[PDB]
Amino acid sequence: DKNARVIELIAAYRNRGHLMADIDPLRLDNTRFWDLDREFRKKLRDILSVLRDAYCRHVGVEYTHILEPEQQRWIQERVETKHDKPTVAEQKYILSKLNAAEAFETFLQTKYVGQKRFSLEGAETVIPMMDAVIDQCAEHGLDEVVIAMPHRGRLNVLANIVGKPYSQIFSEDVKYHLGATGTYIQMFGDNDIEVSLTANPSHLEAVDPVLEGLVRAKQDLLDTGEEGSDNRFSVVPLMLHGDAAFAGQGVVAETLNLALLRGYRTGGTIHIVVNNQIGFTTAPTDSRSSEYCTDVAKMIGAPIFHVNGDDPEACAWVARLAVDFRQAFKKDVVIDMLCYRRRGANEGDDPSMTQPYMYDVIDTKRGSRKAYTEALIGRGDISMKEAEDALRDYQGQLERVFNEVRELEKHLATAVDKAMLQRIGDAHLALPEGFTVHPRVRPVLEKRREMAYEGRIDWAFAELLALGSLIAEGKLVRLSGQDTQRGTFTQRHAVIVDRKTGEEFTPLQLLATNPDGTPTGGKFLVYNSALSEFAAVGFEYGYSVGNPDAMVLWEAQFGDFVNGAQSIIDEFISSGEAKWGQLSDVVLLLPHGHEGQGPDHTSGRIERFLQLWAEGSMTIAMPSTPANYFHLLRRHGKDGIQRPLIVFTPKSMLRNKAAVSDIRDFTESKFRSVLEEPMYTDGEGDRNKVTRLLLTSGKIYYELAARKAKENREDVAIVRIEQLAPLPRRRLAETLDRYPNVKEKFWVQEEPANQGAWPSFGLTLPEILPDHFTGLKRISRRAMSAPSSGSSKVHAVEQQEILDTAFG
Amino acid sequence: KNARVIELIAAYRNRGHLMADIDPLRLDNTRFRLWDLDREFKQRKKLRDILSVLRDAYCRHVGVEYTHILEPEQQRWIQERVETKHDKPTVAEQKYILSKLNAAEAFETFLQTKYVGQKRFSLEGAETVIPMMDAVIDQCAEHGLDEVVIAMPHRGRLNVLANIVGKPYSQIFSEFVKYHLGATGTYIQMFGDNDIEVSLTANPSHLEAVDPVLEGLVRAKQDLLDTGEEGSDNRFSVVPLMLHGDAAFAGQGVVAETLNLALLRGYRTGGTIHIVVNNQIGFTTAPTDSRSSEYCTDVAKMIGAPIFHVNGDDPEACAWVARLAVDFRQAFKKDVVIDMLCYRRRGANEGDDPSMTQPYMYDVIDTKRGSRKAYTEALIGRGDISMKEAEDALRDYQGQLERVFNEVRELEKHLATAVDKAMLQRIGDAHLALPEGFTVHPRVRPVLEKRREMAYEGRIDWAFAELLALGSLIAEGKLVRLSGQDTQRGTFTQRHAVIVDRKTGEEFTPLQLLATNPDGTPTGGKFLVYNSALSEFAAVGFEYGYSVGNPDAMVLWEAQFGDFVNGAQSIIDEFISSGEAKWGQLSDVVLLLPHGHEGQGPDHTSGRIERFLQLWAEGSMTIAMPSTPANYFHLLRRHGKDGIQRPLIVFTPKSMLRNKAAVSDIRDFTESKFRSVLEEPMYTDGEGDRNKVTRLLLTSGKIYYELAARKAKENREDVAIVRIEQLAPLPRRRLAETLDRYPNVKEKFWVQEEPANQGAWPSFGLTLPEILPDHFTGLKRISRRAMSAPSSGSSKVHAVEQQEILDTAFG
Numbered sequence A: 001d002k003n004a005r006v007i008e009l010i011a012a013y014r015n016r017g018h019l020m021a022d023i024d025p026l027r028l029d030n031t032r033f034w035d036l037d038r039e040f041r042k043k044l045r046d047i048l049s050v051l052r053d054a055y056c057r058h059v060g061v062e063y064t065h066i067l068e069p070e071q072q073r074w075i076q077e078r079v080e081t082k083h084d085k086p087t088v089a090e091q092k093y094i095l096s097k098l099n100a101a102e103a104f105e106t107f108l109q110t111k112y113v114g115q116k117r118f119s120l121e122g123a124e125t126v127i128p129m130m131d132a133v134i135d136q137c138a139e140h141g142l143d144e145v146v147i148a149m150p151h152r153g154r155l156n157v158l159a160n161i162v163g164k165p166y167s168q169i170f171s172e173d174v175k176y177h178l179g180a181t182g183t184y185i186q187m188f189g190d191n192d193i194e195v196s197l198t199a200n201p202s203h204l205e206a207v208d209p210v211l212e213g214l215v216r217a218k219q220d221l222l223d224t225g226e227e228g229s230d231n232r233f234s235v236v237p238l239m240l241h242g243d244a245a246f247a248g249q250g251v252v253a254e255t256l257n258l259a260l261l262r263g264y265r266t267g268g269t270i271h272i273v274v275n276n277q278i279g280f281t282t283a284p285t286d287s288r289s290s291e292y293c294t295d296v297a298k299m300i301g302a303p304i305f306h307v308n309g310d311d312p313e314a315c316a317w318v319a320r321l322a323v324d325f326r327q328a329f330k331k332d333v334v335i336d337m338l339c340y341r342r343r344g345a346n347e348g349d350d351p352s353m354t355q356p357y358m359y360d361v362i363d364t365k366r367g368s369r370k371a372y373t374e375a376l377i378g379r380g381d382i383s384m385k386e387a388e389d390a391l392r393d394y395q396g397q398l399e400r401v402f403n404e405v406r407e408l409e410k411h412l413a414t415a416v417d418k419a420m421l422q423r424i425g426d427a428h429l430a431l432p433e434g435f436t437v438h439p440r441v442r443p444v445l446e447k448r449r450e451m452a453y454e455g456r457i458d459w460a461f462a463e464l465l466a467l468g469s470l471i472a473e474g475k476l477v478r479l480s481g482q483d484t485q486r487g488t489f490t491q492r493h494a495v496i497v498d499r500k501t502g503e504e505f506t507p508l509q510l511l512a513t514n515p516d517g518t519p520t521g522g523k524f525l526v527y528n529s530a531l532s533e534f535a536a537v538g539f540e541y542g543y544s545v546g547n548p549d550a551m552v553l554w555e556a557q558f559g560d561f562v563n564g565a566q567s568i569i570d571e572f573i574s575s576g577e578a579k580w581g582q583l584s585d586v587v588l589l590l591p592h593g594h595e596g597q598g599p600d601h602t603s604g605r606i607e608r609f610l611q612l613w614a615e616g617s618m619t620i621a622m623p624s625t626p627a628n629y630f631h632l633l634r635r636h637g638k639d640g641i642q643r644p645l646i647v648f649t650p651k652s653m654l655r656n657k658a659a660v661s662d663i664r665d666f667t668e669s670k671f672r673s674v675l676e677e678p679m680y681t682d683g684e685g686d687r688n689k690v691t692r693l694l695l696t697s698g699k700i701y702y703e704l705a706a707r708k709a710k711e712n713r714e715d716v717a718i719v720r721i722e723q724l725a726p727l728p729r730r731r732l733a734e735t736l737d738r739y740p741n742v743k744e745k746f747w748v749q750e751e752p753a754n755q756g757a758w759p760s761f762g763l764t765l766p767e768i769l770p771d772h773f774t775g776l777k778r779i780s781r782r783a784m785s786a787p788s789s790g791s792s793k794v795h796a797v798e799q800q801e802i803l804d805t806a807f808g
Numbered sequence B: 001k002n003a004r005v006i007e008l009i010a011a012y013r014n015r016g017h018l019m020a021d022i023d024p025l026r027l028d029n030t031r032f033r034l035w036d037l038d039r040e041f042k043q044r045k046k047l048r049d050i051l052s053v054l055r056d057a058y059c060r061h062v063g064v065e066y067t068h069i070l071e072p073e074q075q076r077w078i079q080e081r082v083e084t085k086h087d088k089p090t091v092a093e094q095k096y097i098l099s100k101l102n103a104a105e106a107f108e109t110f111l112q113t114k115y116v117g118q119k120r121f122s123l124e125g126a127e128t129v130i131p132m133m134d135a136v137i138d139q140c141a142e143h144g145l146d147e148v149v150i151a152m153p154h155r156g157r158l159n160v161l162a163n164i165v166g167k168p169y170s171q172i173f174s175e176f177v178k179y180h181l182g183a184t185g186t187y188i189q190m191f192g193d194n195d196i197e198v199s200l201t202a203n204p205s206h207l208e209a210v211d212p213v214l215e216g217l218v219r220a221k222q223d224l225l226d227t228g229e230e231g232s233d234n235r236f237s238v239v240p241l242m243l244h245g246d247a248a249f250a251g252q253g254v255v256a257e258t259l260n261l262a263l264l265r266g267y268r269t270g271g272t273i274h275i276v277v278n279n280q281i282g283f284t285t286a287p288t289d290s291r292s293s294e295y296c297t298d299v300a301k302m303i304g305a306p307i308f309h310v311n312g313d314d315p316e317a318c319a320w321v322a323r324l325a326v327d328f329r330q331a332f333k334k335d336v337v338i339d340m341l342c343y344r345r346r347g348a349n350e351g352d353d354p355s356m357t358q359p360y361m362y363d364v365i366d367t368k369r370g371s372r373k374a375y376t377e378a379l380i381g382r383g384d385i386s387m388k389e390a391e392d393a394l395r396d397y398q399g400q401l402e403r404v405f406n407e408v409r410e411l412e413k414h415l416a417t418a419v420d421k422a423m424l425q426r427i428g429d430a431h432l433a434l435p436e437g438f439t440v441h442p443r444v445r446p447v448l449e450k451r452r453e454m455a456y457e458g459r460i461d462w463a464f465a466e467l468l469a470l471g472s473l474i475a476e477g478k479l480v481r482l483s484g485q486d487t488q489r490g491t492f493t494q495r496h497a498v499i500v501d502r503k504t505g506e507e508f509t510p511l512q513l514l515a516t517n518p519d520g521t522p523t524g525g526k527f528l529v530y531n532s533a534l535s536e537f538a539a540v541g542f543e544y545g546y547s548v549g550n551p552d553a554m555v556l557w558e559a560q561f562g563d564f565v566n567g568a569q570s571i572i573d574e575f576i577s578s579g580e581a582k583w584g585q586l587s588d589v590v591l592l593l594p595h596g597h598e599g600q601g602p603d604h605t606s607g608r609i610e611r612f613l614q615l616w617a618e619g620s621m622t623i624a625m626p627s628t629p630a631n632y633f634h635l636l637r638r639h640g641k642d643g644i645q646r647p648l649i650v651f652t653p654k655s656m657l658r659n660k661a662a663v664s665d666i667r668d669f670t671e672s673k674f675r676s677v678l679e680e681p682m683y684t685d686g687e688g689d690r691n692k693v694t695r696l697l698l699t700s701g702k703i704y705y706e707l708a709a710r711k712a713k714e715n716r717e718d719v720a721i722v723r724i725e726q727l728a729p730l731p732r733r734r735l736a737e738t739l740d741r742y743p744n745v746k747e748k749f750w751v752q753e754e755p756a757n758q759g760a761w762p763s764f765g766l767t768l769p770e771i772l773p774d775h776f777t778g779l780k781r782i783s784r785r786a787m788s789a790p791s792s793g794s795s796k797v798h799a800v801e802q803q804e805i806l807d808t809a810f811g
């Protein structure tokens, strides 16, 4: 019975010991806190001492929620063993990092006005902790550590972690958002590792999936990780957070949900939460519905270590333990560093206005550096002369940054050959030995061989011809989104599944090998994404940043769901180049079109992307033909320019028999930003008979062309704007001049009056081309608060009303 | 040996769910792949009996997850109810469950046969969600609760309408949007004498976005019923029943954000009952590509919610877990998650052969008999029903299938906002009417005193004007709900709606004193002010839902900076701006978006006026950027008293809060009304001559003060500055009447701080020359140049650009 009380007691400490650990350096919560010499083979006093030291000191360990027994066993074996005391050299090294952090903070708060919001005072221990992460990654012989973080302590991280000189850091608010790169050299090791920091907006947590994509991109380049020869995942994501942001931002859960996915895994992220137990003026009880700000990470069974920021030794030990766990199980580790925010939220803030108790406690708190220096003499680890030299190291570090900053102040063809089209065509039939194709998929493969040799190439095959030819030319092609392998409209079939074994076959991957048998250097990476927009779009944006030579495409189920990724569109994709000098070549594929499927299956919001656009930020397009889409993708991947491309892609037009292209359009043409009717360019049509000109974009062209053909209207011409942004001013002016007898011009669109290209075109076209578009009138749906009507019947009436008005 | 028993007990309680027979498809083969049994162990029970209890409780058709819960009493409550030998259900209860499976399959057969293009909405393989939901609602009625509000995606929605909400087929199939509309009904107990209201909220196609909307809605109903957090009783008598899909629950961030609200004082609803229809597929995507955890529900561990994984082919276990979930919610006022393991009989889209992408799963599904047929056959095998009883169950199925076919066949064969001085003075005095022994922080004491001074002597600033508007509404009996990030104090240390005791930390809400009339009687009003969690998506969704749940409430959500509201885009796009036109669902929610170019960067400058103006259509939203405190006071009072349910978008100030020119007089609150268009006081009250004006500057917001200062400095009598206070709907008549008073105007300019592709110019530059061609033909723009970001990252560039605007305007 007494031996059973010991077993229950062991479980109690392992399971719930963290609830009694002395982790809070402020001690704000008061309520928080025989057979002893008999052997059970160790004495009961020694088993309890091991359990109190492991689970109830300055580290709160949460690991019994992990479903993997080997992971639980790994943690308790390393957590319960009696650890060797750190060497005086390691203790002095930790202290020097705390001297540099505090010196940098004192300088930053004294020299400049308006920097209290960015202060790391009360949280300087994050610097020796981050240093231990990076030194441990270098010890494992890893290649790079990429950091993502908020503004708090950023300039401190650049100096004391990234190793950027003060002349670069204080040269000429944007410094808090820019990316950086450096080299970390081991102090007591002979290894080095690249350390980089990614750019981010003020939007807390939005960079989380961006970092993951950047890291995965770098991993695939180094041939490490998921799409690599080795399982080292030699590029480590180090992600910093705030306690209020980590608990309340949905992107955190979405990014955690990507951690073990074949398309998004980076072999585990090291998470550091700077838990200062405050969110601006908000208390944790108003910021989260759980004990810990880190409880979201339990979602993927990640071990969590709550650690007292006033103990830099435990902080550095947990950092190294986190790296080793990540290396052993290729899974996320979360370090909850409990600490405090010495200063207020904004400038001129008296934080005792909203938190009087916390700030009366903080006013009695001596610094982490002073506390650690005093604890070293108390423990007899350092002498008085050594403590004096440490104070002189702090003073010299304080003088150095003041002195250095003082000195700084005083101072292309996209056409492919027939053989290329035929090769991609044949690849759809070059099935592995014994592969069983599903009977409904077999005619698609055969039709693609027929299309490649005989023409009448549809949208779905043209996309694969564009990507296939890029892979054949040595390019890495990454394509992903919801159900992207098959296609939402059962049109892609980039991955085909064996009817009998379930084995996947990727026909385009055969073009990664030249006809002679040698590799091209190209690769096709095609994945079904998780049911996320924010994290998935963020990941793909980050991927194009991490590998600028990659063709990176993200596909929306319907364009209507990309508003769930608005923060990435607004904060990264559309503005990152102008704000940070950070470039991305990410493609967003947005299925768009009025077909009567409702307000959430109709629009990718063209008007919003056109509004976000400014000269040289993005390319926005709605191609009407498969070949033009093929040339758009090939130009985007080969132009040597890093700029996002936004494409409004079809749904019903995928299977429209008029929306097919000839071999000559792929082999002897280029992307055409403005398209005329084939009857004028190739046929016997007379442009001089035209008195009414209809300017349009997308699938409605086919309907307008069908009505023109039906009524035999020689007086009407339909001109297509294929590239919406930048406006193809030169081509649009020279095209329209070919119709001299035009007396009226109309912009025709399916979208309501306040949506589509009209709100920007109606204003821009008469300004950019006043001799051509003065008196431009609109034919569209009436302005609506939704992208369309909920009724198929209303849709059909409205669609006919547009065609009747155009030919009225 | 006794220690091996204790470790074994923990193993079953902690990990037993990994070996439970929960998957009705049995897709994972590897899942399932000494003498001491008769010896008694310490209560003293035999090892064989300890293990039989464990296997039955943790390894049968219910996988229980609860040892992650930090509360020992909650862990004790679950194991005491799960580890006891349960009474076998009565033949009447078993027949009742079967009639609910009969009802559900008849509806599915009818819907798939009668109409084309309904396979994507099919519940076939998941029919057991109906007897499960029925058991939730019957259990809530058993507790004597007032309402169950459901939020769900499209799968099984019409079925839910018919057999849960109880809507007649004539209403469900009328002129066959029905998959998105709200509904309300009454549930009457079969074997009880209670009744309960059952409602279903409207929702977009955007999976999981309705999740915080439901919470808001339910909280509002709870506050009306004086139950829960803001009530006399802790019954939380309005239960949220939230339905989900396995792929959407694991991948949508809003799920975590809505779970994070579960125990917050400003957002708690007393626990939600979550039902996940886990058909182990997401369109064509396998769970291993949809999530990084063993279960789709693993996000719910974040708040320490018990999780029950249950085999959907066992409707008895499904109904038992539903009632256990309601009892847990009632006992601990926390979330319960039911992971109903099932399958998707048909494909994703119409004409989909799901064996194309999932051949194995669908070869298994092709051998699966229905949940109804499986339950009828198991009851025969268990001797619970006779052959005649099974035949009568087949007759009941045929009868319900005929009934819906027959009923659908028959269906086919057919204002002043001005307050008195005393009202301003009362709100002013309330800031000094401190509780006995309350200690005011020294920096907060002059704010309270200035508000008493402002109320009596004038020079009223923006922050006090807002509190005067909300204070007077509370005094008139209105419920006022105000929230957002650091909203109690205000991001710009300007509000102080809640003041904190310097010595005890106790909160004091001065405006709450206005809920009591001077005689001592209640007004019926209340001030509910909260600091939100660091969420935009969930918080905006919550406030939208709150205004839907209580249309007579003044509901305001405040952004830290307007620049962060894009994190709530799905709510703006799918509910606020479009809910009325799409579902006939109305909301009077106010969004306060701090906006203005001050050099604080591209994430501290714009609430994106151009995006809200683009979303706008006649009668959907009111969009405003007031320039004076009194005009903001009248905007809020008109919004709350106009008797119209329409969202209001307000672009609020940052530096203009403390601008001494941006102050108002008592008479502006006492003898005025909201002005959509504002002229310069020199023309309305001064000795200015409107006839001297040849150049007219049309503008909105804080830049007015800079333009007015430049005019006063250069003594420019030839320039007038007209303000558009209400951006949407355009104040066409007031704008036309005002411009008509300046007859010698030869040039007109729209002046704005925002880049040319942003602000009000993209819509105004197009609309104004069309709506008023005699006034705005030849309208020119003065603004920042078009940008890919809301502004520059440099304060220096900002300052040069701002001066360039003022120099151009007076050049």
Ligand SMILES: Cc1ncc(C[n+]2csc(CCOP(=O)(O)OP(=O)(O)O)c2C)c(N)n1
Pocket (backbone or CB within 6 Å): A152, A202, A203, A204, A205, A241, A242, A243, A244, A245, A246, A274, A276, A278, A279, A280, A341, B485, B534, B560, B564, B567
């Ligand atoms: C997405 C987003 N929402 C709101 C803000 C505004 N904001 C800036 S600091 C802050 C509180 C930060 O809390 P926390 O995460 O605990 O970090 P800390 O400042 O304490 O290090 C907020 C809400 C923001 N920058 N981003």
Ligand SMILES: Cc1ncc(C[n+]2csc(CCOP(=O)(O)OP(=O)(O)O)c2C)c(N)n1
Pocket (backbone or CB within 6 Å): A482, A531, A557, A561, A564, B155, B205, B206, B207, B208, B244, B245, B246, B247, B248, B249, B277, B279, B281, B282, B283, B344
């Ligand atoms: C937010 C959002 N993103 C994408 C979609 C498109 N979509 C429709 S159904 C589906 C897969 C649904 O998976 P699941 O949650 O498991 O539900 P199920 O259809 O299996 O019941 C998706 C991605 C959507 N409706 N909402």
Ligand SMILES: [Ca+2]
Pocket (backbone or CB within 6 Å): A585, A635, A636, A637, A638, A639, A640, A641, A642, A643
């Ligand atoms: Ca490019």
Ligand SMILES: [Ca+2]
Pocket (backbone or CB within 6 Å): B588, B638, B639, B640, B641, B642, B643, B644, B645, B646
């Ligand atoms: Ca109203």
Ligand SMILES: [Mg+2]
Pocket (backbone or CB within 6 Å): A242, A243, A244, A274, A275, A276, A277, A278, A279, A280
């Ligand atoms: Mg914090």
Ligand SMILES: [Mg+2]
Pocket (backbone or CB within 6 Å): B245, B246, B247, B277, B278, B279, B280, B281, B282, B283
């Ligand atoms: Mg599913």
